Amino acid sequence: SNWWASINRKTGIRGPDPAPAEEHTNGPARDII
Amino acid sequence: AAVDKAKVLEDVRSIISTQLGTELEKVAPEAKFVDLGADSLDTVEIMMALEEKFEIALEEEGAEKIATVQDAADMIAAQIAAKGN
Amino acid sequence: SALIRPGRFDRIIYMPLPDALGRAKIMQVHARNKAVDPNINWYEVARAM
Amino acid sequence: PAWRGPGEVGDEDKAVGCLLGAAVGNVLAAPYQGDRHFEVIRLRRNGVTDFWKYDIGAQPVQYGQYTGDFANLLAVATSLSASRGVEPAHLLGALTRAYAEGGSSVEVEDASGGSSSGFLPARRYSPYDRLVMDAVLAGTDPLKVPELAERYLAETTRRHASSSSDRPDREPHGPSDLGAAARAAPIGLAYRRAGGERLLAAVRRSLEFSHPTPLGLDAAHVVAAAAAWCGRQQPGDAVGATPAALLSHLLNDVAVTAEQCGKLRLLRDNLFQLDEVTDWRAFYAGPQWARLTALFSRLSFHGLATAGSEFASVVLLALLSSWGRPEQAVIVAASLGGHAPATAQTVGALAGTLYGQSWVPERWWRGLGEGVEGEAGREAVVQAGRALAAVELA
Amino acid sequence: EAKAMYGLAINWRALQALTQALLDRGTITGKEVAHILESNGVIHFPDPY
Amino acid sequence: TAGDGGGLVGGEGVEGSPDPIPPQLRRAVSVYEAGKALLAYITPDYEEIARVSVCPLNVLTGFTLFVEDEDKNVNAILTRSELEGRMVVHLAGRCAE
């Protein structure tokens, strides 16, 4: 499409594909080392 | 821990072509073995040639279910990746 | 400024830094001893130096 | 409406005007060989609308002197009209004659005595066809050269990595370049009433010795078919002489390869028409030049068309963008840089073979007369164009 | 910043292809970069301004 | 790395630097470097790419090796087009991420 027309830095910059905000965590210690 | 899957794929396909006797353009990354002319007793000799070329050992349980070239490549790559540890 | 008077030292020669072809020639001789894959595009690897 | 001038021009004006337009386009775009359009439109802020007198390139051009590509084109025209038909040996001899005379040679330096005596054609010549013309003159067979050359100029060897090929020096020359596609307008003018396959065999015999691969042959076929289309057409019928008709005609029966027809379609549905520009400084900084340059970058790689498909597409883009204004068209074609001489030469040739002669502005004819070519070269090319309207043997 | 956003946004497909190639291959040469990009239809800039 | 500082290398084992470089932090470097190399490819007259790498020597960045031409601006010239192109290419990675 032409989503790159409606890019607006005031209301946040974001792309088309759905927010790959996947993540995980062990404890703070098993992540420092 | 990081394997150049492209190199592994080219080498797998070259080994397969040299073993079966067909030419490298016919060996596609999704080509099964049954149509390339492979019969059981030779989906094994292919495995032995693969191990002999790459100098590794295959995990047998997963090696029971190898039917396309891409699975061969991915098995070999997961073996090479887990070498130090 | 004493040696730069005539007869003592009246000639100076400037030897410049090599170019693409010069560097290619330089590394083509540092390969005559070591082992090297022969078909190396020496010109291109010399262009990036 | 569009250009009017006379009514429907005759048959001699068409030919002499095609050759004249080719000459003026080449000599105009000569000094801008090998640079991009932004560099050019910032070097000539007032527009590229007259000859340049101060060129300082590695092989510098003098005032009003043309390149080697137009020499090739004119030799093609005379050798066709002389042997009364496209013959390989005759035009090969003519080409190498026009390439060798007036030039010079230099010797080289290497310990064991290596004889790399370089030939320096007095006029500027492309590298590939320079190699071709020196192999043909070194005694080697004139027909088996392409396979030897296409793998000698393989200095590209591996070009390991090394991505950006901006350096024109890196562009893929050889049997698929514009070498043969440039000298194919007078041929397509000679056979304008011969039929399709005859045109095809003619253009094939025209390039057998340097450009045998299908791509260069298809580009030359495209330019020749366009020239023939204009030769048959007339600049008065508001129905036949239109960009859409010519484009559809060329795509249907002339286009053969895949990317050729792809580029041609992309040009077809994106084509727009420029307005009459009288102020170049405001044109170069305007939206229309921007749109044109976007399309041109899409039809090429970084603004340098070296493949046959790229060449044909950009030539017809510059030609159809200003339908009805041949002078404006050749100026625009030269203002794009890249391979400016070849492109501007073919655009001028097609414009001449369509509209005739009454469009070449006076100052260009004057500069042609006052250059190093002088009255000698001017009358030479106008007479070589005169001896072109009556040839139909075999 | 605006030019960079625009140039990346109109080349989304080629950007994702090159990202995947780098993720699985580790290192790439310039010639493979050119190949991956051109087989996915990039859209060059007209000028650098 | 030169004192109690540090914080850039990523494979030494000690508290500051993890051992296998988490994969979520490798996807990001791939995105960064892909954006930067794509922008450097579509910019006319930029230098040419010789090699593109991800986390070389285990550092937590990318790396692109650019080869240029010394016979065009002989160690002294800098036009305006070049400077604007360089700015765009250096911001490309942030924008892509």
XYZ file of C-alpha atoms in Angstrom:
707
model
C 0.000 0.000 0.000
C 1.027 3.587 0.737
C 1.213 3.453 4.514
C 4.414 5.484 4.281
C 2.235 8.514 3.638
C 0.671 8.355 7.101
C 3.880 8.296 9.166
C 3.597 10.777 12.020
C 6.288 11.407 14.602
C 3.878 13.061 17.028
C 1.586 10.077 17.525
C 4.418 7.547 17.379
C 6.353 5.947 14.543
C 5.294 2.422 13.660
C 5.417 0.014 10.758
C 2.800 -2.203 9.195
C 3.745 -5.603 10.588
C 2.231 -6.407 14.003
C 4.506 -5.217 16.784
C 6.992 -8.058 17.347
C 7.103 -7.275 21.065
C 7.893 -10.863 22.028
C 10.359 -11.181 24.899
C 11.258 -13.279 27.929
C 13.409 -13.099 31.040
C 15.118 -15.264 33.591
C 16.195 -13.740 36.872
C 18.351 -10.638 36.985
C 21.345 -12.787 37.930
C 21.000 -15.329 35.133
C 20.740 -12.388 32.727
C 23.626 -10.230 33.907
C 25.994 -13.146 33.354
C 26.348 -21.700 17.484
C 25.810 -19.799 14.243
C 25.928 -21.850 11.055
C 26.008 -20.650 7.457
C 22.981 -22.657 6.379
C 23.590 -21.623 2.772
C 26.973 -23.365 2.579
C 25.567 -26.456 4.273
C 22.737 -26.543 1.748
C 25.007 -26.276 -1.289
C 27.240 -29.044 0.036
C 24.290 -31.293 0.876
C 22.921 -30.911 -2.639
C 26.288 -31.595 -4.253
C 26.770 -34.745 -2.161
C 23.273 -35.959 -3.022
C 23.805 -35.391 -6.736
C 27.141 -37.200 -6.728
C 25.658 -40.125 -4.796
C 22.489 -40.636 -6.837
C 23.927 -39.718 -10.231
C 21.494 -36.937 -11.135
C 22.558 -33.403 -11.954
C 22.614 -30.517 -9.528
C 19.759 -28.560 -11.102
C 17.288 -31.380 -10.443
C 18.056 -31.483 -6.703
C 15.779 -28.880 -5.240
C 15.719 -27.878 -1.552
C 12.182 -29.281 -1.261
C 12.650 -32.377 -3.422
C 11.791 -35.526 -1.510
C 14.052 -38.544 -1.778
C 11.519 -41.031 -3.137
C 11.208 -39.247 -6.489
C 14.926 -38.615 -7.010
C 15.140 -42.407 -7.333
C 16.000 -43.160 -3.701
C 14.919 -46.521 -2.207
C 15.296 -47.284 1.549
C 18.698 -49.012 1.301
C 19.943 -45.793 -0.292
C 18.382 -43.190 1.932
C 20.852 -44.805 4.353
C 23.989 -44.799 2.200
C 23.206 -41.144 1.545
C 23.185 -40.559 5.304
C 26.531 -42.317 5.613
C 28.019 -40.248 2.793
C 26.750 -37.097 4.493
C 28.331 -37.984 7.822
C 31.544 -38.998 6.088
C 31.786 -35.669 4.281
C 30.914 -33.442 7.228
C 32.766 -35.535 9.863
C 29.846 -35.365 12.303
C 27.442 -37.826 13.910
C 23.713 -37.679 13.239
C 21.063 -37.741 15.929
C 19.305 -41.013 15.189
C 15.789 -40.370 16.509
C 15.384 -37.390 14.203
C 17.251 -39.223 11.460
C 14.403 -41.715 11.249
C 12.164 -39.012 9.715
C 14.341 -37.556 6.947
C 12.405 -37.362 3.684
C 13.285 -34.035 2.020
C 16.597 -32.351 1.298
C 15.791 -29.428 3.575
C 15.431 -31.742 6.567
C 18.846 -33.215 5.788
C 20.334 -29.723 5.671
C 18.649 -28.667 8.903
C 19.705 -31.819 10.750
C 23.309 -31.322 9.698
C 23.213 -27.656 10.663
C 21.739 -28.360 14.094
C 24.495 -30.927 14.600
C 27.321 -28.608 13.548
C 25.912 -25.831 15.718
C 25.972 -27.938 18.893
C 29.634 -28.919 18.747
C 31.506 -27.088 21.483
C 29.006 -27.720 24.276
C 71.502 23.393 6.068
C 75.237 22.601 5.813
C 74.959 19.321 3.893
C 72.446 20.722 1.388
C 75.165 22.796 -0.272
C 76.371 21.762 -3.752
C 78.524 18.658 -4.111
C 77.678 17.301 -0.651
C 73.944 16.624 -1.089
C 72.466 18.227 -4.201
C 69.895 15.584 -5.180
C 66.753 14.372 -3.424
C 64.498 11.603 -4.742
C 60.916 11.148 -3.557
C 59.530 7.614 -3.341
C 55.720 7.747 -3.202
C 53.078 5.450 -1.794
C 51.936 2.683 -4.155
C 48.685 2.558 -6.118
C 46.256 -0.228 -6.997
C 48.571 -1.994 -9.435
C 51.614 -1.427 -7.246
C 49.940 -2.992 -4.230
C 48.696 -5.877 -6.360
C 52.255 -6.562 -7.484
C 53.481 -6.295 -3.896
C 51.089 -8.931 -2.618
C 51.597 -11.199 -5.622
C 55.149 -11.735 -4.361
C 54.263 -12.200 -0.697
C 52.376 -15.245 -2.020
C 55.343 -16.934 -3.720
C 56.377 -18.380 -0.343
C 53.131 -18.957 1.572
C 50.234 -21.167 0.494
C 47.465 -19.219 -1.244
C 44.356 -20.118 -3.189
C 45.583 -19.235 -6.701
C 42.516 -17.640 -8.323
C 42.462 -14.465 -6.227
C 41.402 -11.236 -7.947
C 44.467 -9.415 -6.660
C 43.391 -6.170 -8.303
C 40.135 -5.918 -6.378
C 41.568 -6.816 -2.993
C 44.199 -4.181 -3.744
C 41.609 -1.542 -4.608
C 40.256 -1.705 -1.053
C 43.613 -1.062 0.619
C -1.609 21.196 -30.693
C 1.807 19.751 -31.489
C 4.527 20.815 -33.906
C 3.167 21.884 -37.284
C 5.922 23.307 -39.500
C 5.178 22.038 -42.996
C 2.507 19.546 -43.939
C 3.622 15.966 -44.505
C 7.292 16.131 -45.445
C 8.775 14.311 -48.421
C 11.235 11.418 -48.409
C 14.613 13.156 -48.826
C 14.081 15.605 -45.978
C 13.323 12.642 -43.705
C 16.669 10.946 -44.344
C 18.890 14.033 -44.416
C 17.180 15.277 -41.264
C 17.671 11.978 -39.476
C 21.406 12.037 -40.156
C 21.642 15.744 -39.297
C 19.785 15.292 -36.018
C 22.064 12.403 -35.126
C 25.144 14.523 -35.798
C 23.953 17.521 -33.799
C 22.806 15.411 -30.862
C 26.137 13.626 -30.691
C 28.268 16.764 -30.920
C 26.043 18.486 -28.366
C 26.117 15.773 -25.706
C 29.781 14.852 -26.302
C 31.362 16.565 -23.240
C 28.883 15.127 -20.700
C 29.986 11.515 -21.052
C 29.989 9.555 -17.822
C 28.266 11.658 -15.162
C 24.890 11.814 -13.483
C 22.029 14.166 -14.154
C 22.393 16.243 -10.996
C 26.033 17.008 -11.769
C 25.043 18.073 -15.280
C 22.090 20.267 -14.324
C 24.334 21.951 -11.784
C 27.146 22.446 -14.300
C 24.819 24.022 -16.878
C 22.285 25.838 -14.686
C 21.117 27.778 -17.748
C 20.321 24.626 -19.695
C 22.255 22.418 -22.101
C 21.195 24.342 -25.188
C 24.366 25.023 -27.195
C 27.778 23.577 -27.923
C 30.530 23.551 -25.308
C 33.981 24.924 -26.081
C 36.000 23.937 -22.984
C 36.087 20.192 -22.306
C 38.829 18.862 -20.051
C 38.141 15.134 -19.797
C 40.815 12.449 -20.059
C 40.193 12.197 -23.804
C 39.165 15.812 -24.411
C 36.778 16.793 -27.182
C 37.355 19.962 -29.188
C 34.751 22.388 -30.468
C 32.039 20.735 -32.528
C 33.938 17.463 -32.960
C 31.886 14.276 -32.759
C 32.654 10.963 -31.085
C 33.361 7.523 -32.479
C 29.781 6.289 -32.199
C 28.517 8.755 -34.784
C 31.441 7.768 -36.992
C 30.165 4.194 -36.738
C 26.615 5.280 -37.556
C 27.649 7.289 -40.600
C 29.856 4.456 -41.853
C 26.858 2.140 -41.529
C 24.745 4.564 -43.553
C 27.278 5.001 -46.355
C 28.216 1.316 -46.559
C 24.547 0.391 -46.760
C 23.817 2.919 -49.494
C 27.022 1.992 -51.366
C 26.865 -1.796 -51.623
C 23.087 -1.291 -51.992
C 22.540 -3.746 -49.152
C 23.732 -4.734 -45.700
C 26.890 -6.770 -46.302
C 29.122 -7.840 -43.387
C 32.566 -7.602 -44.989
C 31.933 -4.276 -46.725
C 30.673 -2.439 -43.656
C 33.301 -4.097 -41.481
C 36.021 -2.706 -43.722
C 34.298 0.679 -43.715
C 34.017 0.698 -39.917
C 37.635 -0.231 -39.345
C 38.738 2.332 -41.934
C 36.847 5.111 -40.154
C 38.294 3.810 -36.880
C 41.963 3.598 -37.832
C 42.723 6.652 -39.972
C 44.009 9.872 -38.441
C 44.785 8.092 -35.177
C 48.075 7.161 -33.586
C 49.747 4.498 -31.482
C 51.972 4.452 -28.410
C 54.375 1.769 -27.260
C 54.633 0.404 -23.730
C 57.251 -0.643 -21.193
C 57.937 -4.121 -19.834
C 61.218 -5.916 -19.190
C 60.955 -8.991 -21.425
C 59.728 -6.942 -24.400
C 55.940 -7.166 -24.218
C 54.348 -5.620 -27.316
C 51.199 -3.923 -26.003
C 51.329 -1.222 -28.657
C 48.111 0.630 -27.842
C 46.051 2.079 -30.706
C 44.646 5.538 -29.806
C 41.732 6.240 -32.197
C 41.830 10.033 -32.513
C 38.057 10.168 -31.680
C 36.572 8.811 -28.393
C 35.538 5.165 -28.677
C 33.721 2.879 -26.277
C 35.995 0.252 -24.685
C 34.220 -2.874 -25.914
C 33.872 -1.889 -29.559
C 37.410 -0.528 -29.361
C 38.553 -4.039 -28.458
C 36.360 -5.450 -31.228
C 37.702 -3.077 -33.888
C 41.301 -3.725 -32.886
C 40.842 -7.503 -32.924
C 39.256 -7.263 -36.379
C 42.215 -5.164 -37.514
C 44.761 -7.440 -35.891
C 43.910 -10.078 -38.491
C 41.620 -12.291 -36.410
C 38.421 -13.669 -37.915
C 35.662 -11.044 -38.119
C 32.814 -13.353 -37.056
C 34.065 -15.415 -34.101
C 35.183 -12.348 -32.104
C 32.138 -12.105 -29.775
C 32.905 -15.271 -27.823
C 36.572 -14.325 -27.419
C 35.807 -10.727 -26.440
C 32.944 -11.430 -24.023
C 35.415 -13.565 -22.053
C 38.415 -11.290 -22.442
C 36.566 -8.223 -21.134
C 35.709 -10.661 -18.327
C 38.233 -8.643 -16.251
C 35.137 -8.591 -13.999
C 36.416 -12.107 -13.227
C 34.917 -12.699 -9.783
C 34.449 -9.074 -8.643
C 34.336 -10.775 -5.210
C 31.844 -8.854 -3.110
C 32.357 -5.254 -4.275
C 28.626 -4.367 -4.589
C 27.852 -0.784 -5.697
C 28.763 -0.796 -9.408
C 28.364 3.008 -9.678
C 31.759 3.166 -11.479
C 30.682 3.065 -15.179
C 33.980 1.199 -15.455
C 32.079 -1.671 -13.789
C 29.018 -1.658 -16.039
C 28.452 -4.875 -18.014
C 29.781 -4.083 -21.474
C 29.886 -6.736 -24.166
C 27.526 -8.432 -26.618
C 24.478 -7.115 -24.716
C 25.487 -3.440 -24.512
C 24.488 -0.449 -26.652
C 27.414 -0.997 -29.029
C 25.271 -2.303 -31.875
C 22.015 -0.637 -30.823
C 23.378 2.822 -31.661
C 24.060 2.345 -35.389
C 20.686 0.832 -36.294
C 18.597 3.884 -37.238
C 19.727 4.357 -40.877
C 19.145 0.654 -41.516
C 15.580 0.875 -40.230
C 15.277 3.893 -42.503
C 16.467 1.999 -45.588
C 13.995 -0.885 -45.245
C 10.977 1.174 -44.191
C 8.869 -0.599 -46.855
C 10.380 -4.096 -46.767
C 8.457 -6.093 -44.165
C 9.215 -7.282 -40.666
C 11.411 -10.324 -41.216
C 13.492 -8.492 -43.815
C 14.183 -5.751 -41.270
C 15.098 -8.450 -38.768
C 17.543 -10.220 -41.079
C 19.081 -6.882 -42.039
C 19.678 -5.773 -38.461
C 20.987 -9.249 -37.629
C 23.561 -9.094 -40.417
C 24.354 -5.617 -39.079
C 25.597 -6.919 -35.703
C 26.725 -10.526 -36.277
C 30.349 -9.578 -35.639
C 30.114 -7.877 -32.243
C 26.632 -8.344 -30.720
C 25.293 -11.867 -31.331
C 23.492 -12.401 -28.011
C 19.709 -11.940 -28.122
C 19.591 -8.847 -25.907
C 21.656 -6.450 -28.002
C 20.005 -7.828 -31.123
C 16.573 -7.151 -29.640
C 17.531 -3.602 -28.667
C 18.799 -2.917 -32.179
C 15.629 -4.469 -33.576
C 13.564 -2.162 -31.363
C 15.356 1.001 -32.444
C 15.264 -0.032 -36.111
C 11.555 -0.841 -35.976
C 10.900 2.531 -34.351
C 12.863 4.317 -37.076
C 10.934 2.428 -39.757
C 7.651 3.271 -38.032
C 8.499 6.966 -38.195
C 9.692 6.657 -41.782
C 6.321 5.220 -42.785
C 4.338 7.612 -40.592
C 3.668 11.318 -41.047
C 3.746 14.198 -38.543
C 0.273 15.469 -39.458
C -2.250 12.712 -38.681
C -3.349 13.263 -35.080
C -4.484 9.615 -35.119
C -1.488 7.626 -36.330
C 1.371 9.734 -34.948
C 0.805 9.290 -31.227
C 2.971 7.778 -28.478
C 0.389 5.164 -27.498
C 0.074 3.702 -30.998
C 3.831 3.481 -31.534
C 4.318 1.946 -28.100
C 1.635 -0.705 -28.592
C 2.863 -1.494 -32.102
C 6.430 -1.922 -30.876
C 5.459 -4.098 -27.915
C 3.213 -6.469 -29.887
C 5.260 -7.546 -32.904
C 8.778 -6.219 -32.136
C 9.232 -7.099 -28.457
C 10.493 -10.656 -27.891
C 12.355 -10.918 -24.596
C 10.954 -10.688 -21.077
C 12.602 -7.671 -19.449
C 12.380 -5.802 -22.756
C 8.590 -5.985 -22.750
C 8.580 -5.356 -19.002
C 10.486 -2.085 -19.316
C 8.356 -1.131 -22.305
C 5.098 -1.718 -20.431
C 6.396 0.199 -17.422
C 7.165 3.076 -19.762
C 3.774 2.681 -21.429
C 1.460 3.101 -18.463
C 3.666 5.752 -16.793
C 4.254 7.993 -19.795
C 3.348 11.668 -19.493
C 3.889 14.687 -21.730
C 6.088 17.674 -20.941
C 4.805 21.178 -21.562
C 6.607 23.672 -23.766
C 9.630 24.698 -21.702
C 11.126 28.081 -22.516
C 12.977 28.613 -19.216
C 15.463 25.874 -18.417
C 16.592 27.189 -15.028
C 13.015 26.923 -13.774
C 12.453 23.592 -15.519
C 15.385 21.845 -13.860
C 14.054 22.920 -10.448
C 10.458 21.955 -11.147
C 8.103 19.068 -10.452
C 8.056 17.873 -14.053
C 11.800 17.329 -14.238
C 11.499 15.506 -10.920
C 8.836 13.137 -12.251
C 10.856 12.539 -15.411
C 13.974 11.781 -13.383
C 12.127 9.368 -11.106
C 10.925 7.426 -14.128
C 14.402 7.526 -15.654
C 15.984 6.121 -12.499
C 13.417 3.335 -12.520
C 14.339 2.478 -16.110
C 18.054 2.199 -15.285
C 20.620 1.525 -12.554
C 21.713 4.732 -10.806
C 21.208 6.645 -14.035
C 23.458 4.771 -16.475
C 21.811 2.592 -19.130
C 24.281 0.059 -20.521
C 22.068 -2.908 -21.377
C 20.146 -3.011 -24.626
C 16.764 -3.024 -22.906
C 17.769 -0.114 -20.678
C 19.060 1.781 -23.706
C 15.935 1.306 -25.803
C 13.654 2.203 -22.909
C 15.483 5.418 -22.024
C 15.754 6.499 -25.666
C 12.042 6.092 -26.265
C 11.322 7.764 -22.925
C 13.231 10.897 -23.901
C 11.654 10.779 -27.366
C 8.007 10.279 -26.376
C 8.079 12.599 -23.360
C 8.117 15.611 -25.693
C 6.054 14.400 -28.658
C 5.968 17.341 -31.043
C 9.207 19.060 -30.024
C 12.336 17.393 -31.423
C 14.778 20.084 -30.275
C 13.412 20.043 -26.737
C 13.617 16.251 -26.898
C 17.290 16.098 -27.838
C 18.127 18.694 -25.188
C 16.320 16.638 -22.542
C 18.033 13.469 -23.748
C 21.439 15.095 -23.396
C 20.585 16.568 -19.993
C 20.366 13.105 -18.391
C 24.070 12.297 -18.505
C 25.221 8.707 -18.365
C 25.746 7.561 -21.941
C 24.844 10.977 -23.271
C 26.415 10.800 -26.773
C 24.792 7.532 -27.863
C 21.394 8.392 -26.399
C 21.266 11.924 -27.793
C 22.475 10.684 -31.181
C 19.732 8.078 -31.513
C 17.066 10.486 -30.256
C 18.140 13.042 -32.838
C 18.145 10.380 -35.542
C 14.601 9.230 -34.794
C 13.343 12.794 -34.448
C 14.818 13.639 -37.837
C 13.461 10.577 -39.605
C 10.022 11.471 -38.279
C 9.701 15.267 -38.492
C 12.243 15.994 -41.201
C 14.621 18.934 -41.381
C 12.868 22.232 -40.589
C 13.419 21.904 -36.824
C 17.211 21.982 -36.378
C 17.918 25.455 -34.942
C 20.266 27.705 -36.862
C 22.924 27.976 -34.155
C 23.558 24.232 -34.197
C 24.098 24.159 -37.960
C 26.397 27.148 -37.507
C 28.461 25.495 -34.785
C 28.715 22.350 -36.882
C 30.092 24.529 -39.659
C 32.529 26.383 -37.402
C 33.943 23.379 -35.542
C 37.010 21.397 -36.497
C 34.755 19.385 -38.802
C 34.136 22.562 -40.759
C 32.369 22.853 -44.073
C 34.178 19.682 -45.137
C 32.499 17.498 -42.523
C 29.190 19.351 -42.702
C 28.803 18.835 -46.443
C 30.207 15.318 -46.120
C 27.436 14.248 -43.757
C 24.727 16.117 -45.635
C 25.803 14.380 -48.855
C 25.976 10.987 -47.160
C 22.424 11.709 -46.049
C 21.400 12.776 -49.548
C 22.707 9.505 -50.978
C 20.212 7.580 -48.844
C 16.663 8.221 -50.108
C 16.926 5.970 -53.205
C 18.350 2.526 -52.357
C 16.218 -0.619 -52.686
C 18.412 -3.318 -54.269
C 17.554 -6.960 -53.498
C 15.854 11.493 9.315
C 12.821 12.021 7.090
C 14.683 10.882 3.985
C 15.903 7.765 5.759
C 12.392 6.886 6.948
C 11.010 7.338 3.446
C 13.735 5.308 1.776
C 13.245 2.425 4.172
C 9.463 2.561 4.026
C 9.184 2.247 0.253
C 11.556 -0.769 0.279
C 9.907 -2.867 2.962
C 10.098 -6.187 1.137
C 13.788 -5.862 0.293
C 14.547 -4.744 3.839
C 12.951 -7.861 5.308
C 14.664 -10.155 2.808
C 18.086 -8.714 3.627
C 17.376 -8.917 7.350
C 16.585 -12.618 7.075
C 19.671 -13.299 4.970
C 21.877 -11.587 7.540
C 20.176 -13.394 10.411
C 20.769 -16.853 8.997
C 24.087 -16.338 7.165
C 26.034 -14.140 9.583
C 28.238 -12.448 6.992
C 27.490 -11.354 3.439
C 29.564 -9.954 0.606
C 28.660 -6.924 -1.445
C 27.756 -8.988 -4.522
C 25.268 -11.104 -2.542
C 23.823 -7.893 -1.113
C 23.272 -6.558 -4.611
C 21.697 -9.841 -5.680
C 19.299 -10.091 -2.734
C 18.239 -6.487 -3.145
C 17.716 -6.599 -6.897
C 15.730 -9.834 -6.825
C 13.263 -8.120 -4.459
C 12.691 -4.947 -6.460
C 14.400 -2.008 -4.799
C 13.590 1.580 -5.769
C 16.696 3.733 -5.989
C 16.889 7.395 -5.011
C 17.079 9.898 -7.881
C 19.700 12.097 -6.180
C 21.559 12.321 -2.864
C 20.140 15.690 -1.770
C 37.421 -1.484 27.279
C 40.128 0.168 29.367
C 39.625 0.270 33.151
C 36.440 -0.316 35.177
C 34.540 0.885 32.109
C 33.666 -1.487 29.411
C 30.229 -2.387 28.175
C 30.680 -2.995 24.454
C 32.149 -6.485 23.986
C 29.790 -9.342 24.607
C 31.325 -12.767 25.057
C 33.728 -12.847 27.990
C 31.602 -14.454 30.706
C 31.943 -11.784 33.405
C 28.915 -9.913 34.731
C 28.953 -7.114 32.197
C 29.050 -9.290 29.081
C 26.858 -12.372 28.518
C 28.168 -15.543 26.925
C 25.903 -16.466 23.961
C 24.564 -12.976 23.062
C 20.785 -13.399 23.528
C 18.888 -13.900 20.268
C 16.552 -10.957 20.835
C 19.680 -8.806 20.881
C 20.933 -10.373 17.644
C 17.754 -9.783 15.690
C 18.162 -6.094 16.479
C 21.718 -5.918 15.167
C 20.582 -7.666 12.009
C 17.825 -5.091 11.521
C 20.242 -2.233 12.160
C 22.811 -3.480 9.675
C 20.234 -4.398 7.044
C 18.814 -0.888 7.109
C 22.231 0.726 6.937
C 23.425 -1.395 4.008
C 20.166 -0.976 2.113
C 20.401 2.797 2.407
C 24.037 2.751 1.337
C 23.077 0.727 -1.726
C 20.280 2.922 -3.099
C 22.159 6.197 -2.678
C 23.827 7.264 -5.945
C 27.607 7.775 -5.935
C 28.125 6.356 -2.455
C 31.101 4.126 -1.736
C 30.743 0.457 -2.511
C 30.068 -2.376 -0.087
C 32.652 -5.121 0.281
C 31.413 -7.048 3.312
C 28.570 -6.830 5.842
C 28.935 -8.513 9.211
C 26.968 -9.023 12.417
C 28.692 -8.939 15.809
C 32.296 -9.391 14.640
C 34.645 -10.374 17.466
C 31.455 -10.615 19.577
C 31.058 -6.833 19.861
C 27.421 -5.816 20.159
C 27.246 -3.875 16.897
C 27.228 -4.475 13.182
C 29.931 -3.564 10.716
C 29.964 -2.652 7.039
C 33.213 -2.448 5.100
C 33.147 0.328 2.506
C 35.714 0.579 -0.254
C 36.097 3.935 -1.995
C 38.028 5.502 -4.862
C 41.087 7.635 -4.194
C 41.297 8.949 -7.761
C 38.029 10.887 -7.475
C 38.558 13.155 -4.458
C 42.240 12.933 -3.798
C 42.227 12.867 0.006
C 41.106 16.502 0.015
C 37.703 17.152 -1.607
C 34.273 17.030 0.026
C 31.213 18.171 -1.889
C 27.803 18.767 -0.383
C 26.070 15.795 -1.981
C 28.522 13.457 -0.285
C 27.903 14.981 3.139
C 24.131 14.781 2.874
C 24.343 11.187 1.679
C 26.536 10.269 4.627
C 24.100 11.821 7.091
C 21.218 9.814 5.641
C 23.183 6.574 5.708
C 24.225 7.064 9.330
C 20.644 7.645 10.481
C 19.254 4.731 8.450
C 20.021 2.137 11.111
C 18.190 3.936 13.902
C 15.217 4.498 11.624
C 15.034 0.844 10.580
C 15.258 -0.414 14.149
